[PDB]
């Protein structure tokens, strides 16, 4: 055991399976959940761990880097750029199934073409954006039509729900046109949680109700400014709901551990960990029967 091997062993083996009854009626205490959360290693990579010349300019935060083994590599669809780097990682889903999500940071003006290239190359049909309206991060989608490198994007439809905005986009590359659904969930401040879990579960139903629209199933892109806290919470919620529906139990600790192996730092706060328990207890009470 290196520190690194102690980290990997913990994340592969930690678990706290809870029956749905225990989650709803007899949950671990707040102090227990915080203690449990603080035990989980971050699995952050250091700048020294990454040998990708030039990547710094494509990171929003120099301390938040994509783990090498699961990072998304861009192909060569950009005649302007020579590298394959984007701050994004493939994320396992329910039962360990590969590439169910990509977690990424919010695009910067200089990584917007990279983002759409990833969307194209990975045959993404759904993007989940988690934000607090408060703006600074750049709008990487057009009001009606914009070109980003070799990609033309066009808004087809836009509808407002109280919790989120759904945009139906078309992305074009050469003679080829694809559909992409975009959902912007807007009252989630970074480092914090939403006021209640109702809208979040609606967002989750919205995601679950989304048709596959690509030639081949692709990852769901989930992002927020750093791509770890709110991104991690959303994905953990989705997996946790899937465990509850299929099995009537959930292992929240194991879900967060599996997320951290895929991308360092997923779920950043003990408050966010506690809210995850709350949201899943809510989902359990909403289940049919």
């Amino acid at each position: 055991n290196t520190p690194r091997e102690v980290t990997l062993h913990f994340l592969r083996t930690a678990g706290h399976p809870l029956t749905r009854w225990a989650l709803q009626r007899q949950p671990p205490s707040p102090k227990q959940l915080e203690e449990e959360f603080l035990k989980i290693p971050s699995n952050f990579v250091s700048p020294e761990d990454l040998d990708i010349p030039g990547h710094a300019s494509k990171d929003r935060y120099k301390d938040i880097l994509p783990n090498p083994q699961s990072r998304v590599c861009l192909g060569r669809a950009q005649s302007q750029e020579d590298g394959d780097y984007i701050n994004a990682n493939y994320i396992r889903g329910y039962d360990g199934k590969e590439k169910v999500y990509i977690a990424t940071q919010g695009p910067m003006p200089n990584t917007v073409s990279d983002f759409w290239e990833m969307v194209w190359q990975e045959e993404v049909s759904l993007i989940v954006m988690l934000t607090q309206l408060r703006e600074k991060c750049v709008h990487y989608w057009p009001t009606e039509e914009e070109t980003y490198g070799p990609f033309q994007i066009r808004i087809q439809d836009m509808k407002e729900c109280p919790e989120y905005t759904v945009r139906q986009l078309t992305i074009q590359y050469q003679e080829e046109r694809r559909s992409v659904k975009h959902i912007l969930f807007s009252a989630w401040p970074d480092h914090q949680t939403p006021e209640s879990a109702g809208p979040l579960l609606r967002l989750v139903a919205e995601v679950e109700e989304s048709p596959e629209t690509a030639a081949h199933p692709g990852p769901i892109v989930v992002h927020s400014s750093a791509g770890i806290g709110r991104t991690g919470c959303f994905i953990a919620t989705r997996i946790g709901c899937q465990q509850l529906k299929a099995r009537g139990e959930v292992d929240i600790l194991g879900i967060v551990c599996q997320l951290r192996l895929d991308r360092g730092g997923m779920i950043q706060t003990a408050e966010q960990y506690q809210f995850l328990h709350h949201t899943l207890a809510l989902y359990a009470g909403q289940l049919p029967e």
């Binding site: 929003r60 935060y61 301390d63 400014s225 750093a226 770890i228 950043q268």
Partner: peptide
Amino acid sequence: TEYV
């Protein structure tokens, strides 16, 4: 920059 710093997110932590």
